Write a protein that binds this ligand. Structure first.
Ligand SMILES: [Zn+2]
Ligand SMILES: [Zn+2]
Lengths: 111, 56, 52
DNA sequence: ATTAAAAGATAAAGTAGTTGAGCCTGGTCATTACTAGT
DNA sequence: ACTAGTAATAACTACTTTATCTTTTAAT
């Protein structure tokens, strides 16, 4: 997530400033700059497990194709819940199950 | 249901020919037979061409 | 039928422009050629080649 | 002593062939605007 | 003053080729 400009609405870029040796977000379309307090700029992970939660919506409770179980909910201890697997299409995706309750409609794993 | 990995849900015919086949088992058997027929049909032409090339 | 109607419209346009450049009056009945549509449909259905 | 010239290695891309044996049956094989006979 | 002949309106695997590269050599 990179910050955007204010008058031309363009994303900014890191740049080094020498008299105060500061990292700043700058725009080339115009002359708008701002201070950058985060050295964290580039992220590239070879193996990730982000996205296993999937796009769960409050309307997932009435899907008839999803299997139904009777697992113990953490907070409301409901006996009605559904379960599925990770949405990620990675080759090495694990088979850990994801459970969603019905009274509170929130997720919980086996951990 | 979704994410079903039981044998009966992935092409296991637990009944015999004498006892008959359930509709799901019938469809899976038909799929397997169609795959076998296609494999034989595509294999015959390649084998014939290979034999002709060897003979020549 | 869309292709055949396009062909018939092109043919009738050619006929009316020829009639105009020859300075004659058409009867609006000899310009239309039902033969192209009939023959195209019959040939396409009889042979199976879906085209002209 | 050091670098312009360039001959040549070769990396990359465009192009081209060719597909198992026989056997039987039926269907088709154009089209229409220009110019001469009576 | 009309009619009918009538002629023109496919992927898989391979080889080959080309331009690119560049390293090489003798020249600046
Ligand atoms: Zn800007
Ligand atoms: Zn719950």
């Amino acid at each position: 997530s990179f910050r955007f400009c204010l008058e031309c609405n363009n994303m900014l870029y890191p740049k080094e400033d020498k008299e105060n040796q500061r990292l700043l977000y700058s725009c080339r379309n115009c002359d708008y700059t701002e201070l950058a307090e985060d050295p964290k700029v580039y992220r590239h992970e070879l193996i990730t497990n982000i996205g296993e939660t999937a796009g769960i919506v409050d309307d997932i409770g009435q899907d008839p194709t999803l299997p139904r179980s009777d697992k113990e909910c953490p907070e409301c201890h409901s006996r009605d819940c559904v379960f599925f697997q990770s949405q990620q299409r990675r080759k090495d995706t694990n088979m850990t199950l994801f459970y969603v309750c019905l009274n509170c409609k929130k997720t919980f794993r086996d951990e | 249901t979704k994410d079903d990995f039981s044998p009966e849900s992935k092409g296991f015919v637990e009944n015999s020919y004498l006892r008959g086949l359930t509709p799901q088992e019938f469809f899976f058997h038909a799929m397997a037979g169609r795959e076998g027929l296609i494999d034989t049909a595509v294999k015959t032409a390649e084998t014939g061409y290979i034999q002709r090339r060897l003979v020549k | 039928f869309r292709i055949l109607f396009r062909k018939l419209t092109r043919e009738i346009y050619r006929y009316m422009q020829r009639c105009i450049e020859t300075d004659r009056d058409f009867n609006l009945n000899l310009a239309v050629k039902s033969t192209t549509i009939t023959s195209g449909l019959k040939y396409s259905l009889a042979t199976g080649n879906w085209g002209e």
